[PDB]
Design a protein around this nucleic acid. Structure first.
Ligand SMILES: [Zn+2]
Ligand SMILES: [Zn+2]
Ligand SMILES: [Zn+2]
Ligand SMILES: [Zn+2]
Lengths: 71, 74
DNA sequence: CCAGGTCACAGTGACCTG
DNA sequence: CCAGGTCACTGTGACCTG
């Protein structure tokens, strides 16, 4: 029992370099294909979790990189 | 004197006066859906998000909050 | 006018393919 | 096993209807 390094949902495998859910995986995936900068609605410290992850993409991506994800 | 109207909620161009405040089509539809039943809205931060035109799709909780704050009434 | 409907559209994530 | 694809679902907001 492994948990997403990004949001802590249950991981599905080791994706882009860390343990991660299908959600963070695909998100990260989408991200590297090109995207306008994201915007945090608050102060750049959101709580990324299983639910809240859909809300702050900016924080999600940041956390994506922080925990390691890379192509 | 006033050249334009702005959305009391998000500050984007207002389109009419909906739910009792000048509002954009976005905030109007948002509020509409929200009053149409139970809502599980969450804040990803501390319940003090900035709702503007770019951050509006981001926190539905705070958006609703301001909807009510500024006067919207069903 | 406005309220409430509608629907093309974009992000999402579970699941498939290779 | 995984990366990268797919696509059913869902929330949005621009528009329409009554
Ligand atoms: Zn995750
Ligand atoms: Zn954030
Ligand atoms: Zn608005
Ligand atoms: Zn919020």
């Amino acid at each position: 029992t492994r948990y997403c390094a990004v949001c802590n949902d249950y991981a599905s495998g080791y994706h882009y370099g860390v343990w991660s859910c299908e959600g963070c995986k695909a998100f990260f995936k989408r991200s590297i294909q090109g995207h306008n900068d994201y915007m945090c609605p608050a102060t750049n410290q959101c709580t990324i979790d299983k639910n809240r992850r859909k809300s702050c993409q900016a924080c999600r991506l940041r956390k994506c990189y922080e925990v390691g994800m890379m192509k």
